Design a protein around this ligand. Structure first.
Ligand SMILES: O=c1[nH]n2cc(-c3n[nH]c(-c4cnc5c(Br)c(=O)[nH]n5c4)c3[N+](=O)[O-])cnc2c1Br
Ligand SMILES: O=c1[nH]n2cc(-c3n[nH]c(-c4cnc5c(Br)c(=O)[nH]n5c4)c3[N+](=O)[O-])cnc2c1Br
Ligand SMILES: [Mn+2]
Ligand SMILES: [Mn+2]
Lengths: 140, 141
């Protein structure tokens, strides 16, 4: 029985700039840092940056849809999305679905997202306007 | 203030095989499924598989170290790692650090991991045997 996500490891090409991105801009808590990576936490999330020479800065058009989204409150959303744009963070997708979403890139091109809402709320929204061929699995 | 990981979206090239891998093999709860993806949950984790034609089946040597690790209890580790090997799931890295770790691949080549241990336990272990040039940022409360 799996109990959830243990940690998220991001391959980075430059450790010093990336540590600033997640600690300074995103306000994550930096717990440890060594010559090959760093340990940060964002609430219940264990984020690990690993220095990888195989890591190339990938433009969004040369990478697939794989992305990682962080939870943020409705009140704090607008100001935080402005913070990243004011800091020059690039956007790789426009929000069109339900709930607040801001799609941005990290220094190495990792596709990140700020999303307001939970899985329970997304399912409820999809019950009123479902996707093409969508089916729901309810256990009651 | 960010409150944690909201959801993890994995681009998949074939929706049906990927949905089976995470629901059947990994035992995750499938909540919804449509022509372009599926919603699954793993404890506090919101997992979303999204069908992306841009997704290419990537062998482990052509992708970087980026990986996603799932929590598992000490008791369940051994049997679960045996379950995956019995089903033919490929391994992309051998465990060398503290705690039980099994590195395996999903149908599309996404590097996954089963890990036993928390960040607090990993930090405590690194205080006795630290990594090269490692420094700790403790506030002492
Ligand atoms: O010969 C040596 N090789 N070596 C590698 C490391 C190292 N580099 N990155 C990680 C690392 C840490 N934490 C994590 C996590 Br959490 C993760 O997902 N990956 N990851 C890698 C490690 N490690 O824990 O062993 C340290 N010392 C040595 C020596 Br001495
Ligand atoms: O013209 C159309 N385009 N279109 C796209 C979708 C769609 N496909 N995947 C996702 C989707 C869902 N949830 C998620 C999550 Br959670 C995530 O991270 N990505 N993601 C994508 C969506 N969406 O509604 O956002 C549906 N209907 C339409 C129409 Br009608
Ligand atoms: Mn998303
Ligand atoms: Mn790992």
């Amino acid at each position: 029985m799996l109990s959830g996500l243990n940690h998220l490891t991001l391959a980075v090409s430059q450790l010093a700039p990336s540590v600033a991105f997640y600690q300074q801009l995103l306000g994550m808590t930096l717990h440890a840092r060594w010559d090959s990576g760093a340990y940060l936490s964002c609430g219940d999330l264990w984020l690990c940056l690993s220095l990888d020479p195989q890591r190339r800065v990938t433009p969004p058009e040369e990478s697939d849809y794989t992305h990682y989204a962080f939870s943020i409150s409705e009140a704090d959303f607008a100001s935080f999305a402005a913070r990243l744009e004011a800091a020059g963070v690039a956007v790789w997708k426009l929000n069109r679905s339900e709930g607040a979403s801001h799609y941005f890139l990290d220094p190495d091109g990792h596709k990140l997202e700020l999303h307001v809402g939970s899985l329970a709320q997304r399912l409820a929204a999809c019950r009123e306007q479902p996707y093409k061929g969508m089916v729901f699995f309810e256990q009651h």
